[PDB]
Amino acid sequence: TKGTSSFGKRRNKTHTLCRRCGSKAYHLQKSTCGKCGYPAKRKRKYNWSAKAKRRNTTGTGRMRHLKIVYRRFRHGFREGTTPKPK
Amino acid sequence: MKFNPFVTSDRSKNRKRHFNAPSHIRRKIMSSPLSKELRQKYNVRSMPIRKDDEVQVVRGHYKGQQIGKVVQVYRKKYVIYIERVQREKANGTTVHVGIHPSKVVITRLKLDKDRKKILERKAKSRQVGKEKGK
Amino acid sequence: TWRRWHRRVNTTQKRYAICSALAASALPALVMSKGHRIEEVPELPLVVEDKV
C-alpha cells in the first residue's frame, strides 16, 4: 500500500541540524547541507529564488560587528582617543 | 515658514519622533509655562517640568487657582501627577489623574544649581535676541 | 513611473498666456469675479513707490 500503510515505516531521519546556518537540511548520508552546502567553503545561494536569498541575507540576523562598523564610520573610524575628561 | 531642507514637516515622521522620543528629550517636550510673576523675575517663558515644583491647572476638569506640588513626572505617558489633582475609584482608594504639563503653569520652581544654570542660559539667550532684534 | 508626467508648451503660447493674465488683472470686473474684494482699492493697476 503506497498510502497510509507505507507512512508507518518512516523512522529514519534523512536530514539533521546543520552546524552552519542552523537548518534541518544536513543530509546525514551525503554529509552535505541542502540549504547552505556546509562542507563547501562557499555559501549555497541561487538567483532563481530571491525569496530564499532575502530569508538569509545580511541584516536578517544580528550584525554584531556591522552595526558597530556603521556607527564607527560616521566618525572616521577613530581609535586610541577618548572624550576630553571633565 | 520652514525653509531648512533637513527638518521634516511630514505628519507621520513628526508623530513617530514624538511618540518614540527618548526620555532625555521627552523631558524637553514636557515643558510648562511659567507664571507671569516668574516670567517677570526670570527672563524666561517656559521651563521643563520637574519633580518638586508647584503648579496650578489652567485647563480641564481641575481648573483653579489652588496650588499643588508635582509628585510624579510620568514621562512614559507624557503626564504629571499633582497633590490634590486626584479622583476616587470604585474601591474607595484615590488615584492621581495624569494631566499634560502644557496644561499647567509653574508658580514656584524647584531650584538647584542645574535649574538655575538653565535659567541664566535661557535668559541670556533671550536678552541676546532682544538686543539683536532691537 | 514612465507615465509622461510632464508636458512641454510652446514658448510663444506661454508668453501669450502671461499677456492674457496680465491684461485681465487690470479689469475690475474680472478681479472681482475672482473674489478679491477690490471695492476700496483706489486704482486697479495698483502701483506703489519703490520704497516698498
Binding site: 541540524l17 | 512614559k76 505617558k77 | -
Partner: protein, 50 residues
C-alpha cells in the same frame, strides 16, 4: 529516544524552557497589546523541527 546527543538534548531543553505562559504582570504594562503566548507548543498537536 532515550539515547541522544548533547546538542539534541540542549535543543529540547530550550524548547521546554520557552514553552510557558506569559507572566501575569505583562498585561499591566503600558501599551501591551499582548493577550497570550501565541507561540505555545504541545507535544501532540505539532512536532518539533528535528
Amino acid at each position: 529516544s532515550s539515547h541522544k546527543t548533547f546538542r539534541i538534548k540542549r535543543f529540547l531543553a530550550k524548547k521546554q524552557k520557552q514553552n510557558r505562559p506569559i507572566p501575569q504582570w505583562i498585561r499591566m504594562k503600558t501599551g501591551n497589546k499582548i493577550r497570550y503566548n501565541s507561540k505555545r507548543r504541545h507535544w501532540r498537536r505539532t512536532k518539533l523541527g528535528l
